[PDB]
């Protein structure tokens, strides 16, 4: 940012850069408290055309246009480098035995082999993961990940199964249509093999992958390229014949939460302070933040009103469901439609104690499971199971859809549609 | 080439171990369970059949794989569990575990259903991504050693049309061009093939009381396998059921992803087979109208309860004599006999599976609102006027009748 010199060791300051001034009095006098300053008191063709292509990845990645990562949607301003200190909760699960283990990233960059896959709910967290990894290796500041000569995060969100590695990459990542070519990459990948690694992001089907991608999954025993594919629990029925073990995005994490807004806050104390008494006493509302995305909610509202000494507990899902509008947005037949979908099966759900549903419960409601949008809301299981099930994010969350369901019947105008809301009153 | 044949047998052996090699699925691919070849179904039994005449004892695998014969058929039922077995032989190569194996420089493993052309084109496509430094038709010129030394696994053979790669039909019908191993996997349906090659022909039987054990406690969490464990030790029914593979993974598959132990009751167990059973096969299916697909599975009902009241489980291809026969063989209703000791007849699943459809085709005459069905379903009940006999040859038809409809039992409490 124009002339912002941040400190690693307690966030973003020294706007405007004091001119002429001397930066180890300037950070003392602004934060006499920093561990950092207290210490210091005390105190052949292909292999040439490989290495080309190495120095420009790494360009790309430490540019600071892939660092900050629009976490939490702050700004394009306001650095948010020092936010970048949380993780997610990972576990691996293997697709035959019924076994489960909590992992932590040292343990997940080690065992990076031939295919493997990263599952989660909608919003889960597993596209500033991938971005962070290409980051770390980039870097060259964290051993275990410097054996791969080249990284390469692409979004298959739009690609034609058609075009060829080279048409791709000099796309997404590098600048001009230049550097390679389709058969300088296709001699570079046969010869370093397992030490060339694809983070491949927005998978949805294999039909719909270029074939030249395809090819390193289907066979990967002819190359053994890493693959490493970030999908959502909604689909992840196409690849599973290719994997031994998934790993599992799990919850996010109360205490991340406390970090984040802390870091990002404190200038109001006394709502903080508020916030975690909240949570202290009604301890099954810490399953609201499951999602970062509902950080982002907290965050998104917080910073509208910051003097506002005061928490309101559904400001959350008021924001959540706001922020929603400003994804992939329809809001005339799809956005609408799908909320009101919705709301009339958590409403039902919520009056039978039920929290779960199959099929047909879900089909009765008109609702698609195949839309977009109902997967922001809700997720799908197709996990080891004779037949498939989906769940509500966060069961705090059906309830508010219920609620907003129930107010809709109350005050809509029609009677076929309004009586309905007295009878579910009424229960 | 040898640097070529070498590579070959190297990406082979690589092959198939990779788990797109091992990710089996034992209910279909629409039901997303996964078993892993390696820790699943291990060890099958085999028999060696002659002229239909059993004749012998038990072959296992390592000893069927040293008393290796020409062109050799392996055959099935009406299809049972899958053709994990040649996979099983290739995997055992692959890891040289066995030494039985030893002997052999390469094995190829084909699917017959999905394959067309010819011999290389199929080995390219299907298994291997072979060069143009193989594929050059003098392959096979210097391959020809292979009297003794390659193996080739074929699956799916009923599955496959002569007509679609004449190449592959030249060879199993000849085999005298390469003189190798080769071993077939086939149904009951191509003894009619079996019969005219003089093959060895390898029979595959049922399960043990530990491989079924085995694949319970392997693929399902510790206090569903101990509660099913237990409940297969009470009723003996299942422990002659889980003898037959598609009622060891359907048993345990209805407990997938559950948190506590439910004996269900051995109705529901029928039931799901039974929708299962004609569902996986509903795209197939569609070479019969719906209209008349219902009429078939609605006359092998009528046939099954005819039969428990005849007292036959047997019932010739006159007595079935339904024109949609291939329906009902499709579907898997019905195992097809062409045996000598087996003319033209059909078998059910298992006697108690027969007791159910009849079961099921009572209940449903029962509960119908068309008069004549209600009065077909009362002249079935009947017949049933004797305590020594409905404590006896109806008692089970009866608990089926009931497990399946609440206004099925109302007619027989009844009638009781
Ligand atoms: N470590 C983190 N700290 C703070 N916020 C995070 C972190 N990781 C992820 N986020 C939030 O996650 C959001 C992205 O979520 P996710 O990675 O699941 O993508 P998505 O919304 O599912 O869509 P896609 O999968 O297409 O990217 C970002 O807006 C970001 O604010
Ligand atoms: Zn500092």
């Known amino acids: ?427 | 080439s040898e640097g070529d044949l070498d590579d070959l047998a190297q990406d082979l052996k690589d092959l198939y171990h990779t788990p797109s090699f091992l990710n089996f699925y034992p209910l279909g691919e629409d039901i997303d369970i996964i078993f892993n070849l390696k820790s699943t179904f291990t060890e099958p039994v085999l028999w060696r059949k002659d002229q239909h005449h059993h004749r012998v004892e038990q072959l296992t695998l390592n000893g069927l794989l040293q008393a290796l014969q020409s062109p050799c058929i392996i055959e099935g039922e009406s299809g049972k569990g899958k053709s994990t077995l040649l996979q099983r032989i290739a995997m055992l190569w692959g890891s040289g575990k066995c030494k039985a194996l030893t002997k052999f420089k390469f094995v190829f493993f084909l699917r017959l259903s999905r394959a067309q052309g010819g011999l290389f084109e199929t080995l390219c496509d299907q298994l291997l991504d072979i060069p143009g430094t193989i594929r050059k038709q003098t392959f096979m010129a210097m391959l020809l050693k292979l009297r003794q030394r390659v193996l080739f696994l074929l699956d799916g053979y009923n599955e496959f049309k002569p007509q679609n790669c004449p190449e592959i039909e030249a060879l199993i019908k000849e085999n005298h061009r390469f003189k190798n191993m080769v071993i077939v996997t086939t149904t009951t349906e191509c003894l009619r093939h079996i019969a005219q090659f003089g093959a060895l022909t390898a029979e595959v039987g049922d399960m043990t009381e530990d491989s079924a054990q085995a694949l319970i406690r392997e693929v399902l969490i510790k206090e569903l396998a101990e509660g099913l464990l237990l409940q297969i030790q009470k009723s003996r029914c299942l422990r002659n059921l889980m003898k037959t593979p598609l009622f060891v993974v359907i048993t345990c598959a209805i407990q997938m992803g559950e948190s506590e132990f439910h004996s269900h009751t051995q109705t529901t167990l029928f039931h799901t087979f039974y929708d299962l059973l004609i569902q996986k096969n509903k795209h197939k299916h569609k070479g019969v109208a719906a209209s008349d697909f219902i009429r078939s599975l609605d006359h092998c009902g009528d046939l099954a309860l005819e039969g428990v009241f005849s007292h036959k489980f047997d019932f010739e291809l006159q007595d079935v004599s339904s024109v949609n026969e291939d329906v009902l063989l499709t579907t898997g209703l019905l195992c097809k006999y062409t045996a000598q000791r087996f003319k033209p007849k059909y078998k059910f699943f298992h006697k108690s599976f027969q007791e159910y459809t009849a079961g099921r085709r009572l209940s449903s005459l029962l509960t119908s609102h068309e008069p004549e069905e209600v009065t077909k379903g009362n002249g079935y009940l009947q017949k049933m006027v004797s305590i020594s006999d409905i404590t006896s040859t109806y008692s089970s038809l009866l608990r089926y009748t009931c497990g399946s409809s609440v206004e099925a039992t109302r007619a027989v409490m009844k009638h009781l």
């Not at chain 1, 590695?165 to 397992?194: F, H, P, Y």
């Open chain 1, 1 to 427: 940012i124009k002339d912002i010199v941040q400190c690693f060791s307690c966030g973003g300051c020294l706007e405007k850069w004091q001119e002429g001034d001397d930066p180890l009095d300037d950070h003392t006098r602004c934060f006499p408290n920093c561990p950092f300053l207290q210490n210091m008191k005390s105190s052949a063709q292909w292999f040439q055309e490989a290495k080309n292509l190495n120095e420009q990845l790494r360009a790309a990645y430490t540019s600071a246009s892939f660092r900050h990562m629009s976490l939490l949607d702050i700004s394009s301003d306001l650095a948010t480098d020092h936010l970048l200190g949380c993780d997610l909760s990972i576990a691996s699960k293997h697709i035959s035995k019924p076994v489960q283990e909590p992992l932590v990233l040292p343990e997940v960059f080690g065992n990076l082999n031939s295919v493997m896959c990263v599952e989660g709910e909608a919003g889960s967290g597993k596209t500033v993961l991938l971005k962070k990894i290409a980051f770390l290796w980039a870097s060259g500041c964290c051993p275990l990940l410097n054996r791969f000569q080249l990284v390469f995060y692409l979004s298959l969100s739009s690609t034609r199964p058609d075009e060829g590695l080279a048409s791709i990459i000099c796309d997404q990542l590098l600048e001009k249509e230049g550097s390679v070519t389709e058969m300088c990459v296709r001699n570079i990948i046969q010869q370093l093999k397992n030490q060339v690694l694809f983070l491949l992001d927005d998978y949805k089907e294999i039909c719909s992958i270029p074939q030249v991608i395809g090819k390193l999954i289907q066979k990967n025993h002819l190359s053994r390229t890493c693959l490493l594919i970030a999908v959502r629990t909604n689909r992840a029925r196409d690849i599973r014949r290719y994997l031994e073990t998934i790993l599992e995005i799990k919850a996010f994490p109360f205490y991340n939460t406390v970090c984040i807004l802390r870091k990002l806050f404190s200038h109001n104390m006394t709502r903080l302070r508020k916030f975690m008494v909240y949570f202290g006493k009604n301890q099954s509302l810490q399953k609201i933040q499951k999602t970062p995305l509902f950080v982002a909610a907290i965050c998104a509202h917080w910073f509208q009103y910051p003097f506002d000494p005061s928490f309101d507990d559904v400001a959350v899902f008021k924001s959540y469901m706001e922020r929603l509008s400003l994804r992939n947005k329809a809001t005339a037949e799809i956005l609408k439609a799908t909320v009101s979908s919705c709301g009339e099966l958590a409403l039902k759900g919520f009056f039978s104690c039920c929290f779960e549903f199959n099929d047909d419960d879900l089909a009765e409601a008109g609702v698609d499971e195949d839309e977009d949008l109902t997967m922001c809301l809700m997720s799908k299981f197709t996990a080891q199971r004779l037949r498939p099930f989906y769940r509500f994010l966060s069961p705090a969350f059906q309830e508010f859809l219920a609620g907003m369901r129930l107010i809709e019947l109350l005050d809509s105008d029609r009677q076929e549609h309004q009586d309905l809301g007295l009878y579910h009153l009424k229960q």
